[PDB]
Amino acid sequence: KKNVLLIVVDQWRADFVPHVLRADGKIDFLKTPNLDRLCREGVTFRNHVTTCVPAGPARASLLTGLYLMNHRAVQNTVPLDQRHLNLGKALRGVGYDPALIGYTTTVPDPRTTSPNDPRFRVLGDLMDGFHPVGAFEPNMEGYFGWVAQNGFDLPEHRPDIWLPEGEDAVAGATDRPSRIPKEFSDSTFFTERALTYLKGRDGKPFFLHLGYYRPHPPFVASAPYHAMYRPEDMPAPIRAANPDIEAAQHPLMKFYVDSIRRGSFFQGAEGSGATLDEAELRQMRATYCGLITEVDDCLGRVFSYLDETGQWDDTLIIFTSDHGEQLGDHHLLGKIGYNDPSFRIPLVIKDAGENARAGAIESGFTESIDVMPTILDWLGGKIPHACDGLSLLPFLSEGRPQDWRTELHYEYDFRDVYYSEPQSFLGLGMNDCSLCVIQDERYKYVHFAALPPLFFDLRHDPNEFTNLADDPAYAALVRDYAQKALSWRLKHADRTLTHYRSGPEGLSERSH
Amino acid sequence: KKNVLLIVVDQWRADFVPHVLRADGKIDFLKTPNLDRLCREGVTFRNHVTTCVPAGPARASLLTGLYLMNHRAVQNTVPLDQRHLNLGKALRGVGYDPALIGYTTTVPDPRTTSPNDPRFRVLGDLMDGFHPVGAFEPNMEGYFGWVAQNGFDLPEHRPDIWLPEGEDAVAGATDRPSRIPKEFSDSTFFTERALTYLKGRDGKPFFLHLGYYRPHPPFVASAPYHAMYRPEDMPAPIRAANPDIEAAQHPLMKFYVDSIRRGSFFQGAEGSGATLDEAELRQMRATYCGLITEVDDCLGRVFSYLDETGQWDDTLIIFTSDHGEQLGDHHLLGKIGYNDPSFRIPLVIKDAGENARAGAIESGFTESIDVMPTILDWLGGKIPHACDGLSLLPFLSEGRPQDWRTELHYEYDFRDVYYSEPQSFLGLGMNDCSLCVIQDERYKYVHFAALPPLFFDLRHDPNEFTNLADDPAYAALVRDYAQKALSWRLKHADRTLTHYRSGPEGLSERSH
Amino acid sequence: KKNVLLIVVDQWRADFVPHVLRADGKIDFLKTPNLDRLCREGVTFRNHVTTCVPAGPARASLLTGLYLMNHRAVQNTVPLDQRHLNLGKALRGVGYDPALIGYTTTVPDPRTTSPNDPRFRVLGDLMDGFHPVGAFEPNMEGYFGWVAQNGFDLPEHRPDIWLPEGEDAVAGATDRPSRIPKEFSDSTFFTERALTYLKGRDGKPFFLHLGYYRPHPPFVASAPYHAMYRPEDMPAPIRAANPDIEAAQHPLMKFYVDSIRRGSFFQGAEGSGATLDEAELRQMRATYCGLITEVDDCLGRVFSYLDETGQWDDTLIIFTSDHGEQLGDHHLLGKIGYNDPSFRIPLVIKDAGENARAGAIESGFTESIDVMPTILDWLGGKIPHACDGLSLLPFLSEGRPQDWRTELHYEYDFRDVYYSEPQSFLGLGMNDCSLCVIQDERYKYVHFAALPPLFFDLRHDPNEFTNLADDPAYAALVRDYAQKALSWRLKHADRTLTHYRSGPEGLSERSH
Amino acid sequence: KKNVLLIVVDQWRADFVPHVLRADGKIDFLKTPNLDRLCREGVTFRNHVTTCVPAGPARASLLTGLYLMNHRAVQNTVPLDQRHLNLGKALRGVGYDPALIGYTTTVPDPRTTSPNDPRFRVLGDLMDGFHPVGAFEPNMEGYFGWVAQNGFDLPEHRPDIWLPEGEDAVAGATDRPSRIPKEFSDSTFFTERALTYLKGRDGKPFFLHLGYYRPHPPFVASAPYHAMYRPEDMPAPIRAANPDIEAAQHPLMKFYVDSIRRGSFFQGAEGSGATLDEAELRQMRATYCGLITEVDDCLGRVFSYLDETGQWDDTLIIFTSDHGEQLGDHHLLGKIGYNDPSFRIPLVIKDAGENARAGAIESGFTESIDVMPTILDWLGGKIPHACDGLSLLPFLSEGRPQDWRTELHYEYDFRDVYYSEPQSFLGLGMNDCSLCVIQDERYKYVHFAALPPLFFDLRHDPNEFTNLADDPAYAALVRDYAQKALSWRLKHADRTLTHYRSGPEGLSERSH
Secondary structure (H helix, E strand, O other): OOEEEEEEEOOOOOOOOHHHHHHOOOOOOOOOHHHHHHHHHOEEEOOEEOOEOOHHHHHHHHHHOOOHHHHOOOOOOOEOOOOOOOHHHHHHHOOOOEEEEEOOOEEOOHHHOOOOOHHHHOOOEOOOOOEEEEEOOHHHHHHHHHHHHOOOOOOOOHHHHHOEOOOOOOOOOOOOOEOOOHHHOHHHHHHHHHHHHHHHHOOOOOEEEEEOOOOOOOOOOOOOHHHOOOHHHOOOOOOOOOHHHHHOOOHHHHHHHHHOEHHHOOOOOOOEHHHOOHHHHHHHHHHHHHHHHHHHHHHHHHHHHHHHOOOHHHEEEEEEEOOOOOOOHHHOOOOOOOOHHHHEOOEEEEOOOOOOOOOOEEOOOEEHHHHHHHHHHHOOOOOOOOOOOOOOHHHHOOOOOOOOOOOEEEEEEOOOEOOEOOHHHHOOOHHHOEEEEEEOOOEEEEEEOOOOOEEEEOOOOOOOOOOOOOOHHHHHHHHHHHHHHHHHHHHOOOOOOOOEEOOOOOOEEOOO | OOEEEEEEEOOOOOOOOHHHHHHOOOOOOOOOHHHHHHHHHOEEEOOEEOOEOOHHHHHHHHHHOOOHHHHOOOOOOOEOOOOOOOHHHHHHHOOOOEEEEEOOOEEOOHHHOOOOOHHHHOOOEOOOOOEEEEEOOHHHHHHHHHHHHOOOOOOOOHHHHHOEOOOOOOOOOOOOOEOOOHHHOHHHHHHHHHHHHHHHHOOOOOEEEEEOOOOOOOOOOOOOHHHOOOHHHOOOOOOOOOHHHHHOOOHHHHHHHHHOEHHHOOOOOOOEHHHOOHHHHHHHHHHHHHHHHHHHHHHHHHHHHHHHOOOHHHEEEEEEEOOOOOOOHHHOOOOOOOOHHHHEOOEEEEOOOOOOOOOOEEOOOEEHHHHHHHHHHHOOOOOOOOOOOOOOHHHHOOOOOOOOOOOEEEEEEOOOEOOEOOHHHHOOOHHHOEEEEEEOOOEEEEEEOOOOOEEEEOOOOOOOOOOOOOOHHHHHHHHHHHHHHHHHHHHOOOOOOOOEEOOOOOOEEOOO | OOEEEEEEEOOOOOOOOHHHHHHOOOOOOOOOHHHHHHHHHOEEEOOEEOOEOOHHHHHHHHHHOOOHHHHOOOOOOOEOOOOOOOHHHHHHHOOOOEEEEEOOOEEOOHHHOOOOOHHHHOOOEOOOOOEEEEEOOHHHHHHHHHHHHOOOOOOOOHHHHHOEOOOOOOOOOOOOOEOOOHHHOHHHHHHHHHHHHHHHHOOOOOEEEEEOOOOOOOOOOOOOHHHOOOHHHOOOOOOOOOHHHHHOOOHHHHHHHHHOEHHHOOOOOOOEHHHOOHHHHHHHHHHHHHHHHHHHHHHHHHHHHHHHOOOHHHEEEEEEEOOOOOOOHHHOOOOOOOOHHHHEOOEEEEOOOOOOOOOOEEOOOEEHHHHHHHHHHHOOOOOOOOOOOOOOHHHHOOOOOOOOOOOEEEEEEOOOEOOEOOHHHHOOOHHHOEEEEEEOOOEEEEEEOOOOOEEEEOOOOOOOOOOOOOOHHHHHHHHHHHHHHHHHHHHOOOOOOOOEEOOOOOOEEOOO | OOEEEEEEEOOOOOOOOHHHHHHOOOOOOOOOHHHHHHHHHOEEEOOEEOOEOOHHHHHHHHHHOOOHHHHOOOOOOOEOOOOOOOHHHHHHHOOOOEEEEEOOOEEOOHHHOOOOOHHHHOOOEOOOOOEEEEEOOHHHHHHHHHHHHOOOOOOOOHHHHHOEOOOOOOOOOOOOOEOOOHHHOHHHHHHHHHHHHHHHHOOOOOEEEEEOOOOOOOOOOOOOHHHOOOHHHOOOOOOOOOHHHHHOOOHHHHHHHHHOEHHHOOOOOOOEHHHOOHHHHHHHHHHHHHHHHHHHHHHHHHHHHHHHOOOHHHEEEEEEEOOOOOOOHHHOOOOOOOOHHHHEOOEEEEOOOOOOOOOOEEOOOEEHHHHHHHHHHHOOOOOOOOOOOOOOHHHHOOOOOOOOOOOEEEEEEOOOEOOEOOHHHHOOOHHHOEEEEEEOOOEEEEEEOOOOOEEEEOOOOOOOOOOOOOOHHHHHHHHHHHHHHHHHHHHOOOOOOOOEEOOOOOOEEOOO
């Protein structure tokens, strides 16, 4: 029997993974024993990125194996064209039910449904082709209904469960717990749906997309996770001397430093994200770690059910996140722009049985578009022609293929959406608001469609403070990275029908 | 605010509706106080039929507003063509989320999915376009997973929860309870999903398809519903002197009398349905009533939540069943053939506010294809051109329209499916295995595509024992009913594009 | 090598086929030596009907193998749903180019094109899936452009080429030629396109739909075909004592007797069709024969090219018409209503090589829906599941199959179109304006959806003057024919997906 | 009234346009009086390119307004995805019939038709959505059938009409005429179809795509066009000292210098294209001019019909070519690679009425993707969101828009097709065989996906002999052009749905 458990957390940074911290001799300032078990038993990928942000685009790439340049779900609220083959439909093609807990943040294709469809009122709904067994639902109604049915009285504005405890509490980074008990938290909800689904399967082969919302904000935690980590034990945020000096690097950086609000990160909070002080940012980081450890506790319950039913060694387990989180770096909160912390994400894979590379940490450059090909390959399917990504299965046996990619790539599109509208400030039209990034161990190149490019020397400037793109001494290097990025564009043009050929013998297909 | 609650039970007969029994001066031998409330407050339709059986075809007609002659989902296991507009997609067209609890028994269109799709392994899965919030799931996994997560230990073969209590129990009609407590029954499950969904909506407008499996078999009930009704208080089954005399009426009757097995109606039971004695049939009927009263108790919890939140007077409530049940009549169990008890079904409608016809019983002839037009009309939508049915809203105000139909119509297709294969016995090919029925207060005509027809005088022979179709004295009457049925066929040919016209002014549409 | 030549004339009656006239000892009052060659070498089907009229519906049935009840292109100007598989697409499935000369009169599906498409300004355009090599074109522009490019000066209103020669001519039935020379006639045009296409093929396998407009009206002929037949040698029209007595038979008969205009049949003519006298009708018939003989002369040129290139014995030749013509019978002109002369059509089939039944006349009942299955069968294709018709190939070898149909069937829908609007006169809505016909050697039954039925004893009343449907002495016979027609409806419900099945082994198909 | 005549020749170079030659003080060594009339009356665009080559890709860009990066019909024999909106369907959206003479070289989408479709046996067939009124047809059957029907006896192998006259003739560049008289030439054929179509329209508004095959090879002409130009009066080919020195520039150049055969350019010829001597190339150029003048003579007949019917001043006339021709430059024949002569093409536009810029020559950079937007704009349509091109109408009134593009762009994909397979020689996989080009008045940058780039200084090296891309002194310039090309990629990602947005008010669209 073969099972696949795809765990997708939200907003969890790659540098909040204890197995990698310890390997580098750093203090592992947070506890994730269940993730650590996956790392001891499988392969941890230390240079994994999402190919775009925020949730809607990231999940389009994860669930189609396509770059943003091909899926075109370029921002939250922008439709996903129905033509793209997604993981749910591909799973049905190999005889698996594509069971899903959590959310996909997918706007339907308007050519397929009425313009009055309620799914157009929200950031996104479930992607067509999945079988929902534990949906957060539009406006988190699935979760709130479950809390209410469990007998907990909700406030009139339901997200006020995430105000800090106590009528005198000041909204923002907090040392207080939220107003929801642990047993009715959202992580508990998704976990109960996972256990219900696995118990219903009763040993039969499964695919399950187990989505967790946490550690997505609001950065407030149920007791006692709110108090589990001391602010002084957290890694310091990395940022310029002040927000103006930070913003001077690039107009897009200035837009986000100026515009991001605390209320998007802490329920009811007022003021700008960029003005948080070091103590507030350390408290935010401690609460973020508490939310992470709650998820890890919950995963322990899922893993316990797999152990008790004898299914652990039959299950391919993939742990990843949709995207990262700035967490105060560069004066930013959220998943925006071009910096490493928004795009670097965990990826740990435990094969069935005793893993040949158990415990290894892989530096090969991997991208979220590789996850769908990996799952389909493992289940014996053909990888769709159109996918941009490649199967990671060679990394679980002999290691990095000799012809594997030598750069990481990602994209970001910042055209206007209802809650964030940079076009007027930037002076740009909607089809000119994008960037792409190419990077390796030494250099990082950020190319904007219609704004200045950026170039960083990562050995000397690992935190991306010193743009070199306009320095004439770097002209040959900038040329080289722009050339690699341009080749990458040409190599990833759409592949839907390009293997077919007419000819004297009729219709044929080219394989190489 | 406008809400719609569409309650769809399964396998509940029209003559098991106490409000109608009492109106006719009959003993109301079962208790349904919550349904009785709907009847006191709304309109009870006493001549409602499903336009086909069993579940898959019945639910295709209910959820598309089309006769079987147009939807072509002619038996369980036969695909529903994606071209037909269903109620879920139509609801999205009026801005409603098409939330659904229970099941639709819909086989996907093979042109839309892989032939390996797991949805082709089961009798049917969820119809495309609905939003599931409480699915029974393939093989009832949703229910069983919920029972297991509630801490109840299930037997190795999970349907053995429906064996009668006690290792010494004989499977079949029983005076013992099932092996599942009331608090973990399937009716409790669907009810908890309904409460969870309504609590999540928190007062916002809703559509909810609230499906119950009961009183579908196995005919066994959780305590104390198994003992709630005395067998001697049940209405007697109506059947011929013996199964051979019954079967002589028609080859299709013979096929079902010979083939139907007790194990399809009582978990683990052996033997033929037709050999049940009168006492066994009375016990079966008493258990069936117990399952009905459990559903009614559950509806009381849903109605209580609507009352407490002040939504009752804002909600159009429609109560109906997918189809009926022979329940021993004519030596048959199940929903098959051509007799009234398989096709007659409850229908009660309570409008928002104080209903103009509260308490009335309507004799106008209504069909399940009318339900979707009624809901869309009530929500301010246009009724799709293709629907065969008509809105029932006039019946809630002034009464039966002057041009309403004057006959009831239904269809049955009995081509081979994996668990019932009459073609060899009947000597028929797959496209020749159907019948249609037309009837009014006086006469009933059953026309087979490729077997003898039947004709009944319902005043003198209300129970359909005496075929008159081959009696020369009835030639003019049989002619007349065949002519009405043939006109009905011509009038209901597909209407997808037939209102459009080319012409000198370009494309236009005819409205009359 | 295998070729198919499908010759489709327009408006040519089955009783204008000399081989059948001579077989019955009647005078063959018109000459068709080239058709007579096909009859001597192949099989002539004497009981062939189109399953509906006029051109648009007839050609939908011919080119899909479907009854009107399934294709739903129910009148000229009504769209053909793109879902139906047509002969052109099916030919591509067997590797044949679906070359077409003439027209198909097909209104596009509005869901597939802009509402501004010029194809919605005309009665119909080319059916999707064919390869046009000689289109009449919208408004006959293809023909008129060819005449103009040939150097012939056209009048300002181009159809005035069909006024009778001479400024003093009275428009109507005429003993004068038209104003177009034979070398620039429409039959010459289609023939030149056929020769161009066959010469381009240069011996390679072909399918060609060779459409002729003639003998469709206006009933005027190029010299000397206008004078080739004497009016006194024509068969007399068959009609009641006067138009009022004719019209009394049925409201639909009255509508057409009252409404049909001479201008629809003779260019520029005034007055009603029903008031033509016997001499005028005989002249009309003589001109109609002249147009037929012109087509036959043209076919001789096509056949000569096949003989000279050695392809005759490699070619399946099918000669047929889209529909018939009343030609004055029952006071009617055109192709309307329910009488035999509108629906009976020629069908002659010459197989490749020496035909086993060369010269035979077949009385088995054949329908235009059989033609597409016949062609696909002959080319080695599978007949589409959805077709209503059956292959005629058994008739070319051993003869009529033992299980062949025992009645002929056809349909007519008379809902309002821009140039003929009977609904107000009849008092009917658009979905109630149809009839179906079932008949055999003895009896004919015409069933209207919402008007009185008709029944004829064809031995005693071969010309359909005496309705018997309301005579009580015929009640059992009328019953029997209504029952056969109702069975036919049930047997021909749509078959798109009804062979598929879900089940424990996955998706399967039933073959019987 | 508004008409559009879109004249599309094949393989005609931009530097074979006399109006531009004379403007630059060069000898106009060929005569095109009818094209010269369009130039005197309209605007001549001197920096127009096709965005890709050869015919199939070029015509996909012309007829969709999309770059190859979006249409993906990347080589002849590769399907065009049906999702792209083409000019024919867009014309129907504005009420115009999309009449077409010539060919489009379009391989159908395999998801829309049988794999056995004969359209998969040829390089391409007609694009879906056009109305053919003069097709060359598969294998030029339309033309050959027309020649045969005109009474001209064709040789057994029909293309042998293009052998030079006389049994002793040596195949290759020739001073002899072909074996087809002028009155039966292919240019005469397309012209007769144009006149037939316009005469059929009889003054009604038209769109006509008037395609000519010439001056596509074989480079042989009907008498007396074969002798109209002296070889010594032709411009000399521009090429390196020998083929080896030429080929050293780049592996793709070497592939084509080594592989191109004379038989692809002269009927029956043997040997390599690269070994033609200067005299042979001058004769080839003189014959090429003869074919051009034959097309111009033919256009004079079309223009004469427009003048005589008073339609000239009501007609937007656009003259262009699908692509250019190397004509011996760089040792190459055909339309391949990256050099200017393969991609630069004529474009002349005459507006209705007296043109504001009559006679002007425009240096603004225009691309073939601009043609479809121009036509739709002129007819009052909306330009489809997805188009990459922009309307040229501002150039006919006030001139180049201030925000017009500042570089020309084109693409070439050289993955294996049945008659040319460079992948093995180049060592590349199928998705790595492309290049893109960006250029302006000063510099040209050729970027290969997986081979070395090229960079040319066009003032000092107008003929592209001296690659500078690997010269360190050019690093900043190469950087700049790679950056412009990378921005162009980002700006032209697919736009199908990217203007739509979900949000609190429902579905909306962004316009800027």
